[PDB]
Structure 1
């Protein structure tokens, strides 16, 4: 996932330390989101993943709370082919859309 890739690419002692701890135990690892969902529903097993996904899950689950803000920095944009004029037009459109609220 993006989170674990960030953890291995991060230079922050806390992030790399927690990643090394969780990777150290093979029983504290999941390969799918719903695996961690079920594990958390079964027992205390915190899942760290894209904040949008966590928010959506909490909005869809009355048994799972949300804790922690935007600890890291990620974002979603629109890919543009190399040598294309669509980038600037798309940027102005999205900037004015978000500006209006």
Structure 2
């Protein structure tokens, strides 16, 4: 199996519902709210000629614009011509933004999962960016030497043509090298080592892809001694 550095995913914070609009838009919608309501006030109380006939003011107007923004209706409507011709602009203004809001919140509430890089080792043969190595004096390093499958052949070609040494001397050496390479050096080992390294602190490593073959550990004896069949 193949071990890489686990990329650090981001968690949704407390105010994770203000996400599908950025803070520039959130301050501009606050500014324009004040502006529209005070313009609607100015145009309403303007000595029409008697004076207390119309029903608008600064306070009525401040929650009229809010009740038009969030779709909750109102209690009254602008009756003067310029009041109507300013209200229609705010009506158009809400229909673009709040629709964008819901239609994009439906996009944030579908996926949170990362796109999962160099999986299944074929891009390890393809790309030249992230390096990879094995253990020296190792059965895996011998396996890629003797292997005849073409993708493994190109992997062995890249491993033997290396600047500097992609190979390491002990297991923890390559562990530390991948823990410090920041996703620039992959590592090849065996899946039991892999899951043991996953189940320890700091959990910054990760197994990707599937397996490649079926090896097996065994008990080894010298050839011909009497311990063989009882073991």
Mark yes or no: TM-score above 0.5: yes
Structure 1 distance, partners of 2:198, 2:139, is: 19
Output aligned runs, 1:1-40, within 5 Å: 1-27=138-164, 29-31=166-168, 32-40=170-178
Structure 1 distance, partners of 2:159, 2:227, is: 44
Alignment partner of 2:167: what SS?
A: coil
Structure 1 distance, partners of 2:228, 2:155, is: 41
C-alpha distance after superposition, 1:25-82 (max 9, x if no partner): 1325132322221221122111001222222212224110111222122111122442
Bigger Rg, structure 1 or 2: 2
Which residue in the other structure is 1:51 paired with?
Answer: 191
Segments ≥4 residues shifted beyond 4 Å? none
Which residue in the other structure is 1:84 paired with?
Answer: 226
Relative contact order: is structure 1 or structure 2 higher (C-alpha 8 Å, sep ≥ 6)? 2
For residue 21 of structure 1, report the CA deviation from its aligned partner. Answer: 0.7
Structure 2 distance, partners of 1:39, 1:16, is: 24
Computed over aligned residues only, the root mean square deviation of the Cα atoms, in angstroms, reads 2.1
Count of residue pairs the alignment pairs up: 89
* Counterparts in 2 of 1:84 and 1:68: CA distance versus 1, 3 Å: farther
Is residue 172 of structure 2 the alignment partner of residue 60 of structure 1? no
TM-score, scaled to structure 1: 0.71
